[PDB]
Structure formats: C-alpha cells, structure tokens
Design a protein around this ligand. Structure first.
Ligand SMILES: [K+]
Lengths: 583, 584
C-alpha cells in the first residue's frame, strides 16, 4: 500500500483512536494481544483493511492484515494476537495502518517488550493514593498506566509506620489506617492494585526508608541504642522533621549497620510482605546526614553501611530490593556491592541542574556497576512551580526524557496522579496537558521499542561527530545540538538532542516556560569511522511518526580529518536517534 | 661511574647533604637554573670528595656536572651550581645530587625543575594566610621555605579590607594597615613584600575574595539591596553567611552575580585593589549551593549558571587572570565549559565526597568538562576532625591523599606560610607537620614537578586490563585494595598503584588522624594486558623510593586466556608507585 504522510496527516486520528497491549512486559513465546480501538470520525463509512507490522529495529519480524468495515460514527475494538519471539530481552515497535483502496489513511503505533525480568529495562512508575474505591476503578487506573508499558510501580506512602509498616497483625490485618501524612489508606485498594498490576506482569514495590522510626518508636519495641546520632555522646538522635499536621513530629533515624535494627525492621517488613503481595522493597534514604555516630560514639560512614543492609534485607525477606541513593550518595557502594535489581538516583535541587547530569548520573551507574545494572533517575520536572495550580511544560518534559532515555536511563515520573512535580509523590498541583500526554505515550513507546539500542550492550564511542553549520556539544550546552555516539555489536548509535532554543542548560525549567525547539530540516551529519562495514543508516524519533524507522541517504566521504559517513537527516525537533547497521 | 648502593647511602643518608633546592619555582625555556646544595658535615670526620649532579627527564640523563669539595667535620657550606634549562616548554626534570668518597656514594638528595612559560598547565598552588608587621628579611625566609616545594602560585587568603571594598584607603593614599574579615591586623607592606619576593621566584600571586559578598554596612559603601540575592521571592530575607560576632561583620550579605550593577561595583573595587597591590590573579571564591534563591524582583536565579558570565566579565574588566572555587563541584561544568579561568579549583567535602574515588573523579570531571583544556586543583583539608586540637597531621593519610590527587593528574592546595591546611579557615594552624611528614612532602612535591609530563600532560584513560596476582585491587579507591589504573600518551603508558590495603573505610580525610602505615608489598607481579608488543622498556618511579629516582624493571611478555600481557616485576610498593612503559 501507499504509506504517505501527505494524506495520513489529513485524516490522522480520525479512524484509529488508540493502540496498546494487554500487558507491560512479556515472557519469550507469550501470547501478545494488541488492542486496537477504532472510532470512525471520517464522516463516511470505512470499508478497508487494517495492517499490522511487528518491527525489531529496522526489520519486519511479523505482519498481519484484517478486513474491517466500520460505519461513520461507529466504534469497534479489534484484537490482534502475536506470539512473542523466543529471544529474551528484546523490544519491538508495532505499527498499525488503516488502508482504503491502496492508500494509508490512518496510523498509530505501540511497543512490545519481551523481557523475562524487569531489571534489565526498568520502566518505573508510581501509585501515590489509596482511597476507598472499587476494583473496577482501580483496574481503569492500572489500564491507563499500562498504556505506557510501565513494568514496575512504586507504592508511595501506603504503609502504616516506617518502623511498623503493617497496620494490625498478620493474623488480622487492619483494613484502614493513617499514613505518615495522616491520609486514610485502605488495605483493599492496596491489594486490588497489586492483583491488577500482577495480571499485567507489573512488579509492585513497597516504599519505606532504610532507617526511620516514629516519635513513639520505644512503644513499638525499637531502642535508642540502635539509633544514629548527630554527636558522639548520644545527645541528639538524627531526625527528619515533618509538618505538624502529620502522624509524627519527626522521623528518628537508625544505624543501618546495627544488627538489632536490621532484625527489627526485617521482621516488621516480613509481616507487611506476608499480607500485601509486594515483589520489591524500595529502600529510600535521605542522603548525606553530616557527621553521624552510633549510640556508643563510633563514627558511622553512612554510605558504607548500605550494601550490607540491602543484601541482608534481600536474604531475610526473599524479595527484590531497590535503593534510592539520593544525589548519588552511596551509589558507588550500592552499584559495586549490593544485589539490587537496578540503581535509582533521586536528584534533590538546586545542585545537578545542568542537562549533562541527566546523562552523567546514568554513566556513573553504568561505570560503578561495571555495566551490570541499569539506572532509574527521579528528576522532578518544573519543581519551581510545584506549589502553584499549574501545568507541566510539554517542551522541557520532552527534553528531560530525551536526555535520560538517550543516555540509557529510565525516568520515574508517571503514576496514578499524572506526573511527579516534587519529592512528596502525592502532591499533584501540576497537571499534564492533553498534548503532553500524547508526547509521553510516544516517548514511552520509544523507550520500550528501542531498548536494545538505548541500554543493551553499549559502550561510549570515540568517533568524531560534526553537524556542519549547527553548533554542537557533547554535554548538553545551551544553544547547541547535544550529540554523542555509542557502539554495540552490529550497530553504532548517534543521538541528537535539540537545545538550540535553550538559553540556560537547566533541565528543571523552574518557571515551566520553555518553548518548542527550532526545527532543523534536511541537514547533514558527519560521522567519522575507520571501518568500511556499513550495511545501512536509519533514524527513529518519538517526534516523527511515533518512532517509525526511516532509512537515510548517506555517502562515504573523506576530508582533512579522515573518512566519514555524510548522513542526510530529514528533520530534528526534540530528539533523533540515528543508527548505523554493520554488515 | 661510581658505586651507588642504597645499603651504603642509607648508613650516612642525610649526614652530608642537608638540602638541595633551586632559586625559582618555575623557569622559562633556556633560563639559567641555580641549583643550591647545602652541606653540613655530620659524618664525624673531614670529607674530601666529589659532589655529582645529574639532570634527568623521566628515564633519560639530559645533563651532568661535578664539583670537588673539602668540608671539615661540623662545617656547613652552600654550593651554587648553574644549569641551562632546555628549550622545550612545559617539561619537568629530576635533579639527583650524590656525595661520593673514593668510588662510593655516601649521601644523596634530589630536587626537581619545572620549565614552564605559564603556571596554568601544571599549577602547584599554595597559600599565605598571615600578614603581620614583619621585616622583608623574615618574609624572604618564608618565601624561600615555600619555594622548596616548587609552589608556582600563592593564594593570599584574608589579606583584603572588606569583601565589597578590598582596598583600605585610596589608590593615591592606601592605608598601611587595616582589619581583615576576622578583625586581624593586616600590614600592607608585608603584602607588598611577599608579592615582590614571590615574583622574584616566578610565583603567581592570587587575591582572595568572594564573588558576591558585602559587609553588614554595604549601603554606606554604595552597594544596594536591589542587587542582592534573596532566599524568598518577595525580597524579605537577603541571603547571607553568618560569621562569629568578634569578626568585622555579623554576616556577609550575598549579591546576585548576574546583576550588572553588582558586577560594575565589585569590578571597580577590585580594580583599585589591583592598582595598589601587584596581584596577578583574582581568586574568586563561592560558598556552593544556597537552596532556592531569587533576585530582588522575585525572579528565580540558579547561581551555578551565573558564574561563567561573571568571571569572563571580571577578566575583561580587570585585565587579570581568574580562578574560581566551585565548591563541591557546584558550578564546575559551567566554569569548565564556559569560563576563561586559568585552571579549575574544587573544594570538596565529606561526608558526600569522602570516598577516595572523589579525589580522582573531581579531576576527571574538570578534565572532561573542559574538553581536556584545563588542569584541576583540589582543596581537601586533611584531618579536619582533630583540627581544633594542638596536634600533628597524620603522615600516612596525608601521603595517600596526595598520591590519589597527584596520580589522577591533579594538584592539592595544602602548603603555605602556616605549614599545612587543616580547615577551610586558612589561618587556623592547630595541626603541625612532623619532621617525617615534611620530608615526605618535599619528596612528593619534587615528584609532582619532575613527573608532570607523565601525570598531567597529553594523557587519556586506558582500557587495558591490569591484574596484581594475589592482591585485592580496585579502579576506584576501595578500602582494602591496591587502587590501580592506567593511562596512555604519545610514547608512554602509565600505571598507578596506590596502596589502600591498610584502609578499613574509603575516606580520604582521616578525621581522627589515626590511619596507619600501609603494608609494604615486595617483589610482586603486575600483569598489564597490551595488544601491541612495541615495548622499549619498563620503569618505575615513586616518591617513597630513593626520593623519586627512576628504576628499570624486569618484565616478560606472556599470554593467557585474557590475552597478551607484560608481567612486570615490582620491587616494592609502600604508598604510591608509578610504572611507566616506554613505547617504540
Ligand atoms: K599611605
């Protein structure tokens, strides 16, 4: 058929309403159900064909055609069934076309991840609210989140107390309790979300600090002798003050290396995991605490304690572990020594404001783990306006995800409340526009479909990149295209992130006022390589036909800096990924 | 030749040659270098022999000289030897001095020479923190003491009058004395004497001030609250740094560096200071992250993004060199990528950057962010936890910190008029260096200088595998390992080994001052996986062994399942060894 963006653009969105899948992640050889929601808004009956293509990078790996009639104004669902190929840890793009005669009149894509374990390609989201609600309402929220292929959900502030997560007892759980902020939590909603997430192969993570206890922790059987102190004379136990309307005036901190604290908190968590079928303990930390000491006055190097705590927790609970190393504090220790599923780094402002840090955090995770662990970043967008009733900026949110995803990272940002705007996950003062939601759908399809080019077996490339006529940088500098290259078996990959509209390289966009980047069309990229082993050159972008691969024209040339490919690029908006297939 | 045994020299080591040093900190190509040799015959017999001098560039002898000397028991003499510096710019040399009787060496001491037309490539930064009334002769002795370490720049810390008005008096009539920030008496003639004396040894002198600081009474000096930095968006609370109440101001109020009126004001004030006092550099300090901050009108200001513009505007307004302290790397990428600073300067702090890795990664970041165009100086104040007690620095932890910084291609600001830094307040001098630590620092600074071409000149990270069979190793300064990594340049590969086998927790600062001597590993093997076989020879130099003298190492070409490698025989590792492999 005649696939053309000339005439698809005229009637795009007017037949195919949505395309998505039944689960977030699939095991090799699973049945994948692709769900296509058709809504004929063409003001005219449709009598034609729905084509489906399954792509692995540039290659067609499967194809289906289905004859469909749908009346003007009618809605139909069409389910397509595909066996997941046998190779583990592979991403695919699914392209759907509505074809009349032999012209494509609509198109929408989704993605499929075939991974036996979430740990290689984490796509982490959150649930922050646990009110009384029907299983059907909960199912709709999980359905929404599943559209983004999120393969893990952090349940934030579900628990009863930091030192006693289970309300009631294992023999008789309390169906309703207060969380840390005196919100009502309903146990049946927690359980419903867990069951629903599991039906979509989504991991569910239980949030708690490593080392926190309420004001009345002595009443619950914890001891001051296990505490972390701000002086060597046990005068002042370290603590994190909270607002006066909350369930405790402060959280008192404990020494993670204290074996009695470990025994106490592991037993308390064991009770919680017995009642609520969580897969993961997401162990939060507060970062550096200044000079700290145990009860007996011995200095405690807090970061030095993390790995032992985390490994012992994994053993005690028989559950997966993730740890938040805030501002990378303890990242070296966790990445080298802890059996965590992946690395997790929250950025707490003002530091690490530069775009470069979005890449550098991921690079640090890769380097410190000898390439054995993936990295998730928490980077709260438009934080500067997070106390206003306002909107996320659709431009800066895309640039931040391009920066993180191109570096081989994941960004924890989507959840039940929409998107994160500050460290307190339930704070929902910023809302996503309809336009931003569409972009996030595309960006998450991209994150999934191109996981093998983004964070699978890659190394930094030394090969020189030039973009003649256009200012470039390797580190996210203002007024440049940010560009760099990576190499893996069978492919070289070049990223271009458009910061030509950026005056100041702050990824946060504190006023939520960034603008659309300038669009550059029909330009050249020069890529200097020695090897004459090129099969072809391709480009994919979440900004262009939701990640559909385009074959690029190129020439082999040579100048005063050596031999290079001159690559013709049709368009750059936010983020393009060029990939060069080797013979 | 003569019989140079370490056994025989070790019996009478230091009993004839008392010191060896030079007249200047840095030399221009083809300058006359004066090597000064202080003799003090403590042999309990008269000496009639020969002093030999060898000038070395890495493994190569580039010059030699000798002088016959008669010196009686108990006599002291100074010898002055002249050497023409070779024509090549940015080169380091080791100078080896031997006292020979008959055909045997009975004493040895080394120094180093740096031929550099500019301090910016190989900064060796120190400080002067005290400016009391004193004779030029006393000032000269202090400068001679600092010159022993080849310090090519000196930061004058808390010399100025006020942060918003550095010059006391007027350009035409400057005050002879004034109060500094801490109500200490500063004497202008001492400032001037140090500047003149420093310059006579080709040492750069840096004027310390904050980027954005004013006294409580800044309105009386012409500064305005409209230029200020604010902790809230309604200009209620101006950002400020509180000080002890006995100091000259209750607090320093902070200004917005991006404010063009603040820039004009402070650049004019600095211009007056520079007209009276012949400083070469403005050393611009910052305080690091200040939380979420705003201008007077309530517009948010991300401070780190204001630094580069400020510093470039400062350099243009003053016509002077600029250095900026980016505390805990806050602003480092901004300054390294966008500012015309002479080199990068990073004060780092535990607990966040306590791990030994941060000593290297700070230098790596500066190098990467500057596209390899700027060197990095690190401020990392040693034994801070005992710095309020009258005590000694721990000689073991100070050596390991310098090994870590120097091997990474960095410099450590630590030595000055008060001895060594133990706190961010440079005049605080409760910790003293023992005699043994001073000797180690002399060797380490000779090493920093003599091997600058292998430490921070044209190097790239190497992917070549290193193994040390039987010994735990790390690439990142982990506790209970030998920290090892490799670098490559035109003509050499370099392998560093830093001994953290005695370290329980990776923390460079040693806050209790209780680190112990590392274990000594003798006669061990290093495996260096190298695909090419074009190897001329393998060498080792260490500031711990024969005061940095190069030794040729035995090696074998071998292969196993991980590839071809060199098996290198290493006689000894104490704190830090540098293996260098000469390529064909
Ligand atoms: K005067």
């Amino acid at each position: 058929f005649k696939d053309d963006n000339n005439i698809v653009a005229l009637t795009k969105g007017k037949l195919i309403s949505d395309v998505y899948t039944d689960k977030a992640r699939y095991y090799p050889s699973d049945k994948v159900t692709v769900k296509i929601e058709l809504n004929n808004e063409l003001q005219e009956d449709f009598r034609g064909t729905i084509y489906i293509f399954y792509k692995h990078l540039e290659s067609i790996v499967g194809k289906a055609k289905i004859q469909v009639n749908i009346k003007s104004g009618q809605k139909k669902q069409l389910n397509i069934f595909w066996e997941a190929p046998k190779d583990d840890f592979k991403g695919y793009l699914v392209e759907v076309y509505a074809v009349k005669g032999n012209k494509a009149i609509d198109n929408k894509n989704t993605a499929v991840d075939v991974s036996s374990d979430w740990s290689k390609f984490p796509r982490y989201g959150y649930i922050a609210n646990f009110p009384e609600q029907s299983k059907e309402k909960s199912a709709l929220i999980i359905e929404d989140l599943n559209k983004y292929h999120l393969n893990g959900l952090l349940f934030y502030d579900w628990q009863y107390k930091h030192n006693k997560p289970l309300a009631g007892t294992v023999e008789n759980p309390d169906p309703k309790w207060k969380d840390i902020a005196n919100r009502d939590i309903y146990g049946q909603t927690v359980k419903d979300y867990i069951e629903l997430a599991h039906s979509k192969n989504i991991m569910v993570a239980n949030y708690n600090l490593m080392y926190g206890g309420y004001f009345d922790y002595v009443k619950d059987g914890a001891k001051p002798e296990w505490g972390l102190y701000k002086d060597p004379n046990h005068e002042e136990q370290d603590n994190h003050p909270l607002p006066h309307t909350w369930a405790t005036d402060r959280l008192y901190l404990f020494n993670p290396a204290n074996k009695d604290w470990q025994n106490y908190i592991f037993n308390a968590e064991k009770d919680a995991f017995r009642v609520y079928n969580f897969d993961v303990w997401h162990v939060d930390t507060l970062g550096p605490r200044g000079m700290v000491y145990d009860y007996n006055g011995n200095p405690v190097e807090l970061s030095f304690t993390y790995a032992d705590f985390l490994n012992n927790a994994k053993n005690a609970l028989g559950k997966r572990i993730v740890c938040n190393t805030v501002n990378e504090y303890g990242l070296i220790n966790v990445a080298s020594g802890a059996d965590v599923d992946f690395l997790y780094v929250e950025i707490w402002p003002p530091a690490r404001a530069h775009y470069n840090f979005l890449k550098q955090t991921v690079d640090n995770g890769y380097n410190y783990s000898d390439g054995k662990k993936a990295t998730v970043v928490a980077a709260y967008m438009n934080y500067g306006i997070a106390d206003r009733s306002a909107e996320f900026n659709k431009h800066s949110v895309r640039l931040t995800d391009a920066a993180i995803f191109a570096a081989g990272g994941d960004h924890i940002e989507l959840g039940d409340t929409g998107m994160l705007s500050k460290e307190y996950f339930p704070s929902a003062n910023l809302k996503m526009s309809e336009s931003l939601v569409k972009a996030m759908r595309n960006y998450y399809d991209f994150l999934t479909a191109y996981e093998n080019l983004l964070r699978d077996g890659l190394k930094e490339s030394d090969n020189k990149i030039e973009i003649p006529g256009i200012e470039i940088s390797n580190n996210g500098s203002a007024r440049t295209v940010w560009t760099y290259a990576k190499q893996k078996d069978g492919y070289d990959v070049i990223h271009m992130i458009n910061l030509l509209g950026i005056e100041v390289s702050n990824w946060r966009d504190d006023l939520g006022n960034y603008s659309a980047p300038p669009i550059i069309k029909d330009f050249k990229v020069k890529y200097y390589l020695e090897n004459d082993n090129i099969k072809n050159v391709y480009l994919a972008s979440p900004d262009i036909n939701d990640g559909k691969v385009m074959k690029l024209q190129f020439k082999k040339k040579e100048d005063s800096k050596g031999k290079y490919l001159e690559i013709s690029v049709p368009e750059l908006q936010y983020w393009d990924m060029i990939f060069i297939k080797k013979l």
